[PDB]
Amino acid sequence: SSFLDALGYLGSLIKDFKRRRFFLNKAHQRIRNKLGVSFAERRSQIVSK
RNA sequence: GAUUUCAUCAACACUGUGUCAUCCAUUGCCUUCAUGACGAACAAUAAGAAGACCUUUUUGAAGGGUCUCUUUCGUGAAUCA
């Protein structure tokens, strides 16, 4: 009866892990894409000049 | 199967298409393919010289190494049919 709840408790941990993965990947892609956008803006300015 | 934007939640990465610009320089503009023929040219492999050159030896003269031509084997080149 201890594991009756202890083994089920892992659902919160796994959902937290997956949500952390989603947030981390979204944030990293967002910042990297912003940096790429800035680099492309520098290229566009260079090409305009 | 679920779920951050539902391309990217990004005005980036792209996909395909259309348009435009751009030889850096050079070459050529299939009848590319076959047979037969020919002017000319070429050398790996090898050979053959009263033409010419250099070095060394004491010199006239001698030793060695070179330039030039030809041929065996052949070789591509391609004006035309």
Side-chain angles (χ1 to χ4, degrees):
Chain A
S1 64
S2 57
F3 283 175
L4 178 62
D5 73 8
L7 201 42
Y9 165 73
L10 191 60
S12 63
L13 265 292
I14 62 175
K15 67 96 180 178
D16 278 325
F17 203 96
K18 76 160 179 278
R19 200 196 193 134
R20 288 271 298 290
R21 293 187 294 110
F22 308 144
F23 274 102
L24 185 150
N25 70 41
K26 173 60 175 295
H28 178 273
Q29 77 83 26
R30 166 171 305 235
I31 60 172
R32 188 55 51 171
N33 191 353
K34 283 166 63 67
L35 172 61
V37 164
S38 65
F39 193 83
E41 294 319 313
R42 178 174 199 247
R43 178 182 61 83
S44 179
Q45 154 267 317
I46 285 293
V47 166
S48 176
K49 156 202 158 185

